[PDB]
Design a protein around this ligand. Structure first.
Ligand code: HEM
Ligand code: NA
Length: 183
């Protein structure tokens, strides 16, 4: 993934746990040779997976729990590190934002030519609920989607309840989430 993602991981870990913990995690991930991440440069996805696994080991937390935390963090991180207007352009409610997500990633994709973005499709079931179909070239990031939705909830001052109904890992075509939202 692009360096931006790995910077945000470092920033979250450093902020919550301090630089020493960050360095420990970086070392264990086998990434000691990397002085700093370059935001607009493409990295092997392995770099990201190794960081997550190392953080799980070091922090004594399941990787999936860390991914949820990271997903929430990304919503704030992007808004503060150069993508605030882009986020604002994607709308001012949860359902519109999720409708705009592929188009938001297409706009990101202009600047990041090699982007492999997720694909999100909404099926609105009522004015307070929807099914979200998440499709990806990558394994294991459904929990991040969970954190992202909660971050979007805080963003739009909207209560959200998210339940995964289909799992790409457990022999299903793709991840599907049931979302209830009020506001
Ligand atoms: C302006 C805000 C955002 C920017 C700049 C951004 C950019 C990116 C970038 C660079 C990646 C890595 C993909 C790659 O390197 O190939 C990524 C991945 C991802 N993004 Fe976004 N993103 C933004 C907002 C969001 C939001 C609000 C969501 C909420 C669902 C989201 C969902 C995801 C997911 C689930 C991935 C994992 C990659 C995958 O599933 O294959 N992003 N994004
Ligand atoms: Na989709």
């Amino acid at each position: 993934m692009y360096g931006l993602v790995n910077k945000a991981i470092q920033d979250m870990i450093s902020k919550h746990h301090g630089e020493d913990t960050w360095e420990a995690i970086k070392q264990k991930a086998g990434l000691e040779d990397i002085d700093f991440f370059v935001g607009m440069e493409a990295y092997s996805d392995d770099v990201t997976y190794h960081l997550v696994g190392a953080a799980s080991e070091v922090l004594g937390k399941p990787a999936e729990e860390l991914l949820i935390a990271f997903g929430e963090y990304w919503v704030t991180y992007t808004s503060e590190e150069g993508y605030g207007e882009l986020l604002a352009s994607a709308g001012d409610s949860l359902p519109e934002f999720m409708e705009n997500l592929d188009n938001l990633h297409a706009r990101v994709g202009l600047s990041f030519p090699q982007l492999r973005p997720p694909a999100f499709e909404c099926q609105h079931t009522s004015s307070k609920s929807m099914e979200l179909h998440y499709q990806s070239t990558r394994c294991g990031l459904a929990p991040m989607v969970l954190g992202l939705l909660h971050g979007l909830g805080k963003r739009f001052q909207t209560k959200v309840e998210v339940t995964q109904t289909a799992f790409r890992e457990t022999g299903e075509d793709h991840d599907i989430f049931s979302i209830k939202y009020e506001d």
